[PDB]
Protein backbone atom coordinates (compact mmCIF):
# COMPACT_ATOMS: atom_id res chain seq x y z
CA UNK A 1 0.00 0.00 0.00
CA UNK A 2 1.00 3.63 -0.40
CA UNK A 3 0.77 6.44 2.14
CA UNK A 4 -2.50 8.32 1.88
CA UNK A 5 -3.26 11.88 2.95
CA UNK A 6 -1.35 12.69 6.16
CA UNK A 7 0.71 9.57 5.54
CA UNK A 8 4.45 9.82 6.04
CA UNK A 9 6.32 11.08 2.99
CA UNK A 10 8.10 8.26 1.21
CA UNK A 11 8.19 9.92 -2.21
CA UNK A 12 7.04 13.15 -3.86
CA UNK A 13 5.51 11.36 -6.86
CA UNK A 14 2.11 11.80 -5.17
CA UNK A 15 3.14 8.92 -2.94
CA UNK A 16 -0.38 7.65 -3.67
CA UNK A 17 -2.22 9.99 -6.05
CA UNK A 18 -2.95 13.74 -6.33
CA UNK A 19 -0.68 14.34 -3.34
CA UNK A 20 2.80 15.67 -2.72
CA UNK A 21 5.62 15.25 -0.24
CA UNK A 22 5.21 18.00 2.31
CA UNK A 23 8.23 20.30 2.21
CA UNK A 24 7.32 21.70 5.61
CA UNK A 25 6.58 20.08 8.97
CA UNK A 26 4.76 17.84 9.21
CA UNK A 27 6.29 15.86 6.35
CA UNK A 28 3.42 13.77 5.03
CA UNK A 29 1.42 13.44 1.80
CA UNK A 30 -0.77 16.50 1.32
CA UNK A 31 -3.23 17.06 -1.54
CA UNK A 32 -1.53 18.89 -4.39
CA UNK A 33 -4.61 19.30 -6.55
CA UNK A 34 -6.31 21.08 -3.66
CA UNK A 35 -3.31 23.37 -3.19
Tab-separated table of C-alpha atoms in Angstrom:
chain	number	residue	atom	x	y	z
A	1	UNK	CA	0.000	0.000	0.000
A	2	UNK	CA	1.001	3.628	-0.401
A	3	UNK	CA	0.773	6.442	2.143
A	4	UNK	CA	-2.503	8.321	1.883
A	5	UNK	CA	-3.262	11.877	2.953
A	6	UNK	CA	-1.352	12.694	6.162
A	7	UNK	CA	0.705	9.569	5.541
A	8	UNK	CA	4.454	9.824	6.044
A	9	UNK	CA	6.325	11.076	2.992
A	10	UNK	CA	8.104	8.256	1.212
A	11	UNK	CA	8.189	9.917	-2.214
A	12	UNK	CA	7.036	13.149	-3.860
A	13	UNK	CA	5.510	11.359	-6.857
A	14	UNK	CA	2.109	11.802	-5.168
A	15	UNK	CA	3.137	8.921	-2.939
A	16	UNK	CA	-0.383	7.650	-3.671
A	17	UNK	CA	-2.216	9.991	-6.054
A	18	UNK	CA	-2.952	13.736	-6.327
A	19	UNK	CA	-0.681	14.344	-3.336
A	20	UNK	CA	2.804	15.670	-2.719
A	21	UNK	CA	5.616	15.251	-0.245
A	22	UNK	CA	5.213	18.005	2.312
A	23	UNK	CA	8.228	20.297	2.212
A	24	UNK	CA	7.324	21.702	5.611
A	25	UNK	CA	6.581	20.078	8.970
A	26	UNK	CA	4.759	17.838	9.212
A	27	UNK	CA	6.288	15.860	6.348
A	28	UNK	CA	3.422	13.770	5.026
A	29	UNK	CA	1.420	13.443	1.803
A	30	UNK	CA	-0.773	16.501	1.324
A	31	UNK	CA	-3.229	17.061	-1.537
A	32	UNK	CA	-1.527	18.888	-4.393
A	33	UNK	CA	-4.608	19.298	-6.545
A	34	UNK	CA	-6.311	21.082	-3.660
A	35	UNK	CA	-3.307	23.369	-3.190
